Ligand SMILES: [Mg+2]
Ligand SMILES: [Mg+2]
């Protein structure tokens with residue numbers, strides 16, 4: 011049972027306030043924290059902010075913390091329920107909120123508490139978090155995921171002209187996860203040199219996700235750099251490329267703009283038909299095997315088209331916003347074959363696990379993801395393992411809000427011993443391993 | 444007694460390997476990670492690296508990890524010593540190393556254990572970490588430190604012509620530590636807007652410590668930016684500026700090059716006296732209240748002369764390298780009046796605390812420090828509090844390897860309830 015719940019305001023990796031919760035049980039103290047996004051789809055579970063302009067620019071989260079300490083806490087404590095009952099405790103909060111998008115308490119308030127409970131439940135069962143999570147999702151044989159490092163930030167994640175948002179490297183040819191870390195870290199370091207020597211030292215700083223933010227515009231340039239770093243590191247036959255366009259960030263009047271960070275100019279606009287032609291080039295020119303949000307969150311048409319031709323992975327983000335309703339539609343229209351799992355987009359663990367299953371049962375793939383605004387919390391590490399998704403993207407091997415996850419994953423592999431199995435080339439369908 | 448010690452190779456905030464230790468006792472598991480400094484002093488303890496230029500660019504630390512699992516672990520365990528015995532345990536490791544700079548096992552291999560022991564000890568004493576540290580140090584009046592956020596970077600920490608390395612903002616006028624975080628964050632966000640409106644969006648990316656590095660040359664321009672961000676954020680009477688010149692980086696043949704990041708041209712080199720005059724102006728025109736490594740680590744004449752001609756805080760880093768011996772000479776020659784405390788620079792908790800008490804004993808100020816290469820570990824957050832140094836620099840308010848420390852400090856303050864104090868304008872001498 012829950013003894014005491016106490017939330018507070020801490021700062022995420024961007025310097026903005028976020029929710030953190032301490033949940034007490036006879037087993038001990040369990041703490042968790044909520045991440046925050048920069049490029050958020052309109053259909054995302056509401057994130058409740060204070061709006062007090064004279065404090066943190068209105069980004070404060072004192073209201074969400076109050077809802078937790080003064081309302082949610084006594085509610086879950088009275089329930090007498092044990093922290094092991096994730097599904098029950100989560101519903102109680104959903105019902106108490108009473109809104110569809112968690113607009114009364116905020117998805118950040120409910121999620122914080124949900125995460126803390128999961129951790130407490132695992133302890134009550136004397137099992138590591140990833141084990142408890144697997145039991146909740148109904149899994150048995152855990153599997154370490156292939157990491158997708160965003161080594162080159164763009165869009166709203168970094169200061170530069172680059173339209174597209176993320177350019178990732180996936181060590182599918184690694185021997186294990188620990189080895190995958192070495193490959194990604196090594197390629198990343200080489201990449202720093204390639205950029206320094208080609209664009210100068212003043213271009214080796216990093217963006218919100220730890221990726222380098224050079225001063226360029228061409229989306230193919232970023233792809234050439236990554237391809238070079240990989241080859242220069244001697245991993246052409248082991249590391250592939252993935253990317254997140256985040257078209258919704260530059261959607262303007264039924265036209266995708268590859269230069270939104272620059273003064274508005276309708277002259278430099280392309281249609282979804284054009285935008286898709288570019289990907290067909292990227293997929294053939296570079297070892298790209300995955301493309302997230304290649305179109306706008308409401309451009310269902312283009313999506314179903316692209317997926318019908320390409321044989322690679324098409325990840326939905328703002329299109330599905332980890333929401334069963336939006337997913338049902340995409341599954342129906344075959345708009346994509348992969349789901350990006352963002353827990354704070356749905357607002358609770360229970361729904362996130364249910365959202366993952368919905369994807370998997372439909373033959374889709376699942377990539378657990380962080381938010382551009384992260385914290386030292388490492389929950390998603392045990393999450394991706396417990397759900398056996400086989401793939402996670404939680405930043406470049408730079409900035410600890412990212413490394414915290416990757417380090418925890420290497421510990422999980424260590425903890426599994428011989429039972430540790432790397433997804434590898436089966437990152438899309440690890441159920442065969 | 445220690446039951447088990449298992450070391451592993453994790454990655455730091457820069458993507459480079461480092462040491463992490465798990466220490467098991469009847470009370471559970473205790474983990475700690477060791478940071479890695481960039482511009483390190485040449486006298487500090489030595490960080491052991493594998494040297495395999497093919498693996499992690501020769502930055503692997505598998506060796507240090509083995510020195511722990513294969514040698515240290517069985518040793519400390521077989522001694523049956525309690526984890527509350529920080530000194531006896533640290534010493535036992537120090538002698539097992541033999542060298543006077545922990546080069547046999549690596550300061551990182553030794554510190555990893557030293558930390559995990561301290562955290563375990565605190566659990567043994569049924570006290571929070573910062574309280575245990577206070578008992579080991581012999582302090583009772585806990586106090587929160589004023590945070591020093593590195594907002595603008597230069598020297599060898601970023602890409603630009605900026606000679607001086609760090610430019611920090613200190614919310615000495617905040618109401619509490621929690622409030623100090625708001626002031627710092629807010630100024631930080633304002634600064635990013637200033638740089639965007641003057642140097643362009645392409646100049647708002649962060650460096651290793653979460654700060655910005657706009658392409659500029661004049662160190663005065665850096666000071667000007669910070670001053671504007673502060674005033675525009677509306678905290679002119681509550682936030683001061685801290686400086687970290689890292690002069691050793693541009694010391695050249697007895698002179699100094701404030702443009703050393705541009706093809707060597709010895710015709711611009713300036714003398715220590717000329718440099719100190721520049722500082723004097725900065726202290727006059729800007730709210731500079733603290734300067735770290737204003738001169739080369741071995742330019743004693745300049746340190747002592749400067750310290751005797753100013754009333755601001757003079758911080759020794761590459762000068763003292765958290766080394767008792769080095770500190771003794773600085774004290775005796777009045778080289779500086781504040782010691783930068785870097786735990787990995789000395790190698791052990793006991794020695795680190797030893798170094799801090801020596802400084803404070805001579806009326807010195809003490810500022811706890813992070814390393815350009817940090818981890819999710821927050822030990823130093825509890826350290827600066829238990830040692831009552833009143834000041835700590837552990838990054839700008841960006842990048843979690845920095846926010847991790849700052850958030851811990853806010854918990855600690857919350858944990859201290861009413862009996863909680865904030866150094867405030869007394870960060871130089873909180874002992875008052
Ligand atoms: Mg987004
Ligand atoms: Mg996305």
Ligand SMILES: [Mg+2]
Pocket residue numbers: 687689735736760761
């Ligand atoms: Mg320094």
